[PDB]
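Section: Multi-chain targets

For targets with more than one molecule, the full set of components is provided together so that the structure can be written out for the assembly as a whole rather than chain by chain. Components appear in the order listed by the source. The example entry contains five components.
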Amino acid sequence: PYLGFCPYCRHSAPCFSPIKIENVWDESDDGSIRIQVSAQFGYNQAGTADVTKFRYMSFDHDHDIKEDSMDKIAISTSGPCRRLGHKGYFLLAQCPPGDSVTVSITSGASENSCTVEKKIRRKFVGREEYLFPPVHGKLVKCHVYDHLKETSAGYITMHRPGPHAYKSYLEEASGEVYIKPPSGKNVTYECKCGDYSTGIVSTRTKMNGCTKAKQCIAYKSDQTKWVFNSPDLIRHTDHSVQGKLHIPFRLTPTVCPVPLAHTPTVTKWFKGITLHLTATRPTLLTTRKLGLRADATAEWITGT
Amino acid sequence: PPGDSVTVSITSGASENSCTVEKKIRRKFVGREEYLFPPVHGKLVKCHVYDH
Amino acid sequence: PGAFGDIQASSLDATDIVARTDIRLLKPSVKNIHVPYTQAVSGYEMWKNNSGRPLQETAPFGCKIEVEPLRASNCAYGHIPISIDIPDAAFVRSSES
Amino acid sequence: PGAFGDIQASSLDATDIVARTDIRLLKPSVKNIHVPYTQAVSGYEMWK
Amino acid sequence: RFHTVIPSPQVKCCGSLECKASSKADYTCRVFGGVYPFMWGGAQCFCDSENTQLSEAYVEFAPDCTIDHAVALKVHTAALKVGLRIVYGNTTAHLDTF
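Its structure, encoded as tokens over all components, is:
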């Protein structure tokens, strides 16, 4: 449940948010898109399975894990999107056409939203443009994202979290530096004010030989976590592959309905035909001879 | 956001009064490359903005 | 880079992937931690946009292309010389016909 | 069909309306009851 | 489509780093000088200079490539096989031949 560096927060400027969008996939033929963000969906603080609520990292100096409900998640590209599924780091939603995708949590007035540019176009399957799958038409082979949340499109490797230094842990007083770990939590500190010196402290601790606050750092020994191999975090010294989550919503094949155009009117003439064609939308016409030379011609036709 | 007109509205309960005026609000950028948002990484150039 | 087959592998699950995508890393200018990089567009998408019509709509001689395995069915061209040993049992002598 | 005056009548309320719009019915395919068809665009709209 | 995966950057806080030689697809590693990066606490290091960073990047196959992928083949001399229905007198015969 880490927090990334979103390029576009609610206001405008880049900022650190718990819902940074890392990757977006839209390879499905029905317009559904799979989104990956840092927050974990379907879980509470302990991680227990529950559809209603998700978790994230808090905006405080303890950075414990906080929870929120499903009703406060909004996905939108140009208009609001319909949430089709959610599992762990991943969401899957059907969205209208747009140039960017945005995911937001509305905790009352706190509307924390992250937006990332992604040209989401309206795509179709077959040789006929359309807005909706027609009620009547041919049934062709298509590939769509499976809405089942327990499927597997692949995997993502996650590793142990790295050091996350904090200045609230450090205190400056009378030109001297102190470490104030949170109560009951052991904090690894290290500093350099001459001779480099590390260690672990668990209480309000003095440090000698240091005059400025920008010479030491302190962070709690948080080995109780896993983080995706994100480019917005500082990695641990031992960055071995210590995890593999599944990528839900496998892109499975199925049958899609596609329209059938108005049958053309063929008028014959000596060594030739004339097709009178009517197609409200761009329809593909492909002709070829059956001799030595194909003389293949292809054209998208609109109107009459 | 980009739009062809600008509207300002007050919603006093069920009494909604909105005034709309035509104004071609377009998306404009500074520099020599189009971008939807100011990217995290890039050059720092001179721009002029309404002071908040 | 920027053209078809910029990333190649013997199989989807093969770990010996070789690619040349012209990826280059730049100096991080912003204060916050982040790694910048610019990379040429995926050549697979470039070919997909400019793929052109498939061979099912361009093969001559009315040849119906098919896959798994690759083949061309119902293809009309040329002449087949056939030498056939028709059995003598089916033959009927003229004295009875 | 697809040209001006594809539907004609002597008046708006006249019952002797004559038209040739090239409408063809298609065999239904879905389980649910519905009648599919195809038809040329309105030639009046094309002229407009 | 390639998924350009970017490992989480590492910083040698008050020392130096050297680019290793891995065998990933289009592997690219660079080393930058003092950066003094921020994550959320206003500081990640204690040395305003000699605070190098290692920028690492490579590519893999996209998760949805198992369906949307292209296979490159070379062809050789092709053999033509024909199914024939042949009738003589009373007897018909179906036979597949090369």
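The interface with chain C takes residues 1-2, 4, 6, 9, 24-26, 28-30, 32, 35-39, 44, 53, 55-61, 65-66, 69-70, 72-73, 75, 78, 80, 82, 86, 88-91 of chain E (CB under 8 Å).
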